């Protein structure tokens, strides 16, 4: 389930990174128009006046693109934190699950162990504790019954 | 002018990096305020000092 979570988060983080990178590229191109005006000025409402107007226009336009890039970075950081948490949970689960199983073991575990889903994945620890209690209580009940049968046998 | 533009780009990079701290702190403060409001509404259900 955590690997499925990581699969979703990888795509979401990739989309956020694409948005942030495109915004940053547009911002840097807006900054680069400053150098293009210099190149035109060297190459040649005169040219110098047009270069001045365009540099001022680029500096004015820069603010909104910078704020949009800040919002994109906010989204990207949120998704990166989500991916980091999912990866940490998957790493925690990974070494325990790698032990391997025989069929007679896994099918035995299939005896009314829960089928946890992705939505229930955050609560999986609670389910594991609940079934730990469920098996422990029945084991000790059967132990008491065995003691009673011992008394009956004697 | 070129040196000033390079320093301007460097400072813009530094400000972009610093924006992460403000975003994280804003999100943490929003979550903390929401949780505090929840705790306050749950606590004010009526109770004597005893």
3-class SS of residue B46: coil
How far apart (Å, rounded) are the C-alpha atoms in residues A130 and A119? 18
Q: What tokens does A108 get?
A: 């035995």
* Other CB atoms within 10 Å distance of the CB of residue A27: 19
Beta carbons of A73 and B19 less than 8 Å apart: yes
How far apart (Å, rounded) are the C-alpha atoms in residues A110 and A6? 26
User: Which experiment gave this structure?
Assistant: cryo-EM
From A80, A81, A86, A27, select the one nearest A58 (Cα to Cα).
A27
Beta carbons of A77 and B5 less than 8 Å apart: no
Residue carrying the six token digits 């990174």: A17
How far apart (Å, rounded) are the C-alpha atoms in residues B12 and A34? 16
Cβ of residue A52 closer than 8 Å to a chain B Cβ: no
How far apart (Å, rounded) are the C-alpha atoms in residues A59 and B9? 12
3-class SS of residue B48: coil
From A73, A67, A63, A76, select the one nearest A14 (Cα to Cα).
A76
How far apart (Å, rounded) are the C-alpha atoms in residues A68 and A61? 12
DSSP per-residue codes, A38-95: HHHHHH---HHHHHHHHHHHHHHHHHHHHHHHHHHHHHHHHHHHHHHHHHHHHHHHHH
Residue of A34, A69, A77 with shortest CB distance to B23:
A77
This structure's resolution (Å) is 3.7
Residues from chain B that touch A73, judged by Cβ atoms under 8 A, are 16, 19-20, 23
Residues from chain B that touch A31, judged by Cβ atoms under 8 A, are 9
């Amino acid at each position: 389930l955590w690997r499925e979570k990581i699969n979703l988060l990888n795509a979401r983080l990739a989309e956020a990174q694409t948005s942030e990178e495109q915004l940053q590229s547009q911002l840097d191109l807006q900054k680069k128009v400053v150098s293009d005006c210099m190149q035109r000025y060297l190459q040649v409402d005169s040219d110098a006046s047009v270069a001045k107007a365009k540099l001022d226009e680029a500096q004015t336009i820069e603010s909104e693109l910078d704020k949009q890039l800040r919002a994109a970075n906010k989204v990207t950081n949120v998704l990166d934190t989500e991916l980091t948490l999912a990866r940490a949970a998957e790493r925690k689960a990974q070494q325990t699950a790698q032990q391997g199983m025989k069929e007679e073991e896994r099918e035995l575990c299939a005896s009314h162990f829960p089928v946890v889903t992705l939505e229930q994945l955050p609560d999986i620890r609670d389910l594991e504790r609940q079934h730990e209690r469920g098996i422990q209580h029945e084991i000790e009940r059967v132990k008491a019954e065995l003691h009673r049968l011992n008394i009956e046998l004697t």
